[PDB]
Design goal:
- With about 575 residues, the protein is of the alpha+beta class.
- The chain folds into four domains: about 90 residues, no CATH class; about 200 residues, no CATH class; about 230 residues, no CATH class; about 50 residues, no CATH class.
- It is about 45% helix and about 10% strand.
- It is built from 23 helices and nine strands.
- The strands form three sheets. Strands 1-5-4-2-3 form a five-stranded mixed beta sheet.
- The structure holds zinc ion (2 copies).
- One zinc ion binds next to loops.
Length: about 575
């Protein structure tokens, strides 16, 4: 490990030699500590148009070394015992099988510089020097060394991210975890489709639907998980394999991290730590690898439930042919009984033995959130109540009687995130264009929420019609950004929910917003609506005044549209 992280530690120790020191009283328990050195937000438009939520802490409650240290000590400075050898044998077998299924109709490839550039443009990438540094680190990797692939507690230098993209980006670009290729994956599906996936699963004969969340998934990715994820390199030709093995072994299996920590009299230090497991969040293929390993975990849980695996198999896997047979016979059926998106999963097992199939799950360190370790899981009878990707999904009916299945979540989080501006010296223009992005996203996905349809229409009425939406409104890969457009949102709504919606049999267009339904009031309120409560009523009654205010701020000379009418 030390020989692997060596030149990175040296490269930092020398960039910072005059302030470099070793803190004997550092707080790191499960990370290797190597030394330290000395170290150095509201969207106004949305806020002006969402006054009732100024006093809603669920909304308003949404950098400092003092915080990073706290979250590090409680979340990341932890360790889990190794799984037993039999458990590890099962993990390796299932991983090998799954990789071979995923690669049956797809071949790994190197992703290109121009792919990365084009993906970025949707100008460090248009400096030759950047690519000189990149080529440089690359030849280091090809020689068997790493100088500069270091995490900031988990952001990374754009060059390192390009090398990762080059070696493993194919998993994303060629949709290895798409539902067609993986059975249980959902990569490429939007929030406008996931609900249909859950409904489909609800129809499969079997037990309840289970959606257990793992407590701190990324922190419970083991070195064995990483080794099993690395098995994809066996499907690569040798050069590609060299690049990928470099990325995995020097960046995944042996990571170096810089993290901030408070010092004396307002001063700040940077600590350099390292370890050999856990997932570095926010890497290029973090999502794909999380999806992979979660699929493996659920397959194993099903095998325990169905009594293919027994207690004795934890210590040492006796006859492994039973595992191979179960995978070849039932593997794909079980995969199609899953919806897995990174660390999130829903499973429809063949019966409810799944609920108490916990031995391998717990031995793998994948302990369930908010539950006693050996308390059986509780599943759902009603697919519309199942949590998945921070949402639940409801069937609603258009005025003409056709049904749609829509994404829903507690409203406070949506409004709270829309109020956040990532910039600083952000003009009214960038602020307004971001507000417009949120509004149009709500029009596409959360139109069925009264407060959000109203607020979105006010925002869209307060921003010049020709201003193009900018910024990002979600980190979920299932928010596909169809709303990032100046195209009319009813047209976009039709394309998303009718035209290109395979679960919409009748392709008759919807020609007005009033034909598009809300949740029932009970449901709207349950999920955080303020309909009926006085500040919200006042807000709605005054909304045109407020819109005119924002218009006067941005400029009365601009062209505005009335989406409130
Ligand atoms: Zn490197
Ligand atoms: Zn809801």
């Amino acid at each position: 490990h030390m020989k692997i992280i060596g030149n990175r530690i040296e490269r930092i120790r020398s960039e910072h030699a005059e302030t470099w020191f070793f803190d004997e009283n550092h707080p790191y328990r499960t990370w290797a500590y190597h030394g330290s050195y000395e170290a150095p937000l509201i969207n106004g438009v949305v806020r002006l148009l969402s006054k009732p939520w100024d006093v809603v802490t669920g909304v308003t409650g949404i950098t400092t070394p003092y915080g990073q240290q706290r979250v590090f000590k409680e979340k990341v400075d932890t360790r889990v015992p190794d799984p037993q050898e039999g458990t590890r044998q099962v993990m390796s077998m299932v991983s090998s099988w799954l990789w071979k299924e995923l690669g049956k109709h797809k071949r790994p490839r190197v992703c290109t510089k121009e792919e990365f550039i084009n993906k970025v443009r949707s100008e460090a990438v248009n400096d030759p020097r950047f690519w000189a540094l990149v080529d440089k680190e690359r030849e280091h990797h090809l020689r068997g060394e790493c100088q500069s692939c270091v995490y900031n507690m988990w952001y990374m230098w754009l060059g390192a991210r390009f090398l990762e993209f080059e070696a493993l980006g194919f998993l994303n670009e060629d949709h290895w975890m798409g539902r067609e290729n993986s059975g249980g994956g959902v990569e490429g599906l939007g929030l406008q489709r996931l609900g249909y996936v859950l409904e489909e699963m609800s129809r499969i004969p079997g037990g309840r639907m289970y959606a257990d969340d793992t407590a701190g998934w990324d922190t419970r990715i083991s070195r064995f998980d990483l080794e099993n994820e690395a098995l994809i390199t066996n499907q690569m030709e040798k050069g590609h394999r060299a690049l990928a093995l470099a990325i995995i072994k020097y960046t995944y299996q042996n990571k170096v991290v810089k993290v901030l920590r408070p010092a004396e009299k307002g001063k700040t230090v940077m600590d350099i730590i390292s370890r050999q497991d856990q997932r570095g969040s926010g890497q290029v293929v973090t999502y794909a690898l999380n999806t992979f390993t979660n699929l493996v975990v659920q397959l194993i849980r099903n095998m325990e439930a169905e009594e293919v695996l027994e207690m004795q198999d934890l210590w040492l896997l006796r006859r492994s042919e039973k595992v191979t047979n179960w995978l070849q016979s039932n593997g794909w059926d079980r995969l199609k009984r899953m919806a897995v998106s990174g660390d999130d999963c829903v499973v429809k097992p063949i019966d409810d033995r799944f609920a108490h199939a916990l031995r391998f799950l717990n031995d793998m360190g994948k302990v369930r959130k908010d539950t006693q370790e050996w308390k059986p899981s509780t599943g759902w009878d009603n697919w519309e109540e199942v949590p998945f990707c921070s949402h639940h999904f409801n069937k609603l009916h258009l005025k003409d009687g056709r049904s749609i299945v829509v994404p829903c979540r507690h409203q406070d989080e949506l409004i709270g995130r829309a109020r956040v501006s990532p910039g600083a010296g952000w003009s009214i223009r960038e602020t307004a264009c971001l507000a417009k992005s949120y509004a149009q996203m709500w029009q596409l996905l959360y139109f069925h929420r009264r407060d959000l349809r109203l607020m979105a229409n006010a925002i869209c009425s307060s921003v010049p019609v020709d201003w193009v939406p900018t910024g990002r409104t979600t980190w979920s890969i299932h928010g596909k950004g169809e709303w990032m457009t100046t195209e009319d949102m009813l047209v976009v709504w039709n394309r998303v929910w009718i035209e290109e919606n395979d679960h919409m049999e009748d392709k008759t267009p919807v020609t007005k917003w009033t034909d598009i339904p809300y949740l029932g009031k009970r449901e709207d309120l349950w999920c955080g609506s303020l309909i009926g409560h006085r500040p919200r009523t006042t807000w709605a009654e005054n909304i045109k005044n407020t819109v005119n205010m924002v218009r006067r701020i941005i400029g009365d000379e601009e062209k505005y549209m009335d989406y409130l009418s």
